[PDB]
Amino acid sequence: GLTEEQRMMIRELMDAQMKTFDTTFSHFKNFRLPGVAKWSQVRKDLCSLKVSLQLRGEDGSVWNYKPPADSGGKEIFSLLPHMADMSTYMFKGIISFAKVISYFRDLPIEDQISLLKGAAFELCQLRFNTVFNAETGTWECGRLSYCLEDTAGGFQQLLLEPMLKFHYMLKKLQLHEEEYVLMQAISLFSPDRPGVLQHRVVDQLQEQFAITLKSYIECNRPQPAHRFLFLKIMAMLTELRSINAQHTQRLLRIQDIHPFATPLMQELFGITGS
């Protein structure tokens, strides 16, 4: 079954998640909002986001934003300031998650920074899948809601952008909170990240989290639908890392044309300021 050590690993991760995941986004406030040539062509990477924004007030008021269509203009950058603020809020939560976990704290500062930089996007996306509604194509973030706008091919066309397909595929697995936090742990403690000194310790931690995840699934999911779940999750994690490397390249190209990264995002991506 589950060993007490395995049950102590899950509890440590689960408590770290509860303390640092504001699932209602109640402290996300004071954020920016959109106002009331091969480089540029590629930089039209932005069209795959296609998101509408809803902001519900406590008074009952609802503000709704619909994005501009591309007209060969700067209007494509209208939502980047808001998204940078949301990304920064999510990343701060992820940093707090790592810092409250005993195993991460024990690691050297240099390794802690290297691991956070490598896994920050992946951990944020894993948390965002918990708030994603597959039926509505919407990410429900407290009073903010982010809805995918209609596209010609509809669902299938959205499933062509890897980030979106990841979200739909992961949600279909119908994971428990314990399985999400183990995926975060496996992704955070990745030994093959640039700059990791204590690779052997990190690799052993990762294997223990994966063993714990495999054991959790074996003990709590006996149904033929959950056959090969551990391996599906591990493949998902491998795809997320490829998505992460692609997203980094897309982001840095936009930044090069149209700077928008916040200070914390600049630190994450090694932008110096000079």
Ligand X SMILES: O=S(=O)(c1ccccc1)N(Cc1ccc(Oc2ccccc2)cc1)c1ccc(C(O)(C(F)(F)F)C(F)(F)F)cc1
Segment near ligand X (CB under 6 A), from 8-16, 95-103, 119-127, 225-233? Answer: 119-127
Please give the residues from 120 up to 149 whose contact with ligand X meets the rule CB under 6 A.
120-121, 124-125, 128, 139
How many C-beta neighbours within 10 Å does residue 197 have? 12
Burial of 144 (0-12, 13-18, 19+ CB in 10 A): middle
Residue 274 CA to residue 44 CA, distance in Å, equals 26
- Which residues inside 38-97 make contact with ligand X, applying CB under 6 A? 49, 51, 80, 83-84, 87, 90-91
Query: Residue 155 is encoded by which pair of tokens?
Result: 């669902």
Q: Is 26 annotated as a binding residue?
A: no
Amino acid identity at 144: L
- Per DSSP, 36 falls in state -
The site that binds ligand X (CB under 6 A) totals a number of residues, namely 19
How does DSSP classify residue 256? H
Report in angstroms the alpha-carbon separations of 66 from 51, 92, 148: 8, 28, 10
Residue 121 or 189: which CB sits closer to ligand X?
121
Q: Of 10 and 80, which has the nearer Cβ to ligand X?
A: 80
By the rule CB under 6 A, 107 interacts with ligand X: no
Least Å distance between CB 188 and ligand X?
13
Smallest distance, ligand X to C-beta of residue 244, A: 9
Residue type, 178: E
Distance of closest approach, residue 261 Cβ to ligand X, in angstroms = 7
Residue 247 counted as an annotated binding residue: yes
In the numeric block, which tokens belong to residue 222?
A: 């006996």
CA–CA separation, 253 and 165 (whole Å): 22
Question: Which residues of the chain form contacts with ligand X (CB under 6 A)?
Answer: 49, 51, 80, 83-84, 87, 90-91, 120-121, 124-125, 128, 139, 163, 247, 251, 265, 268
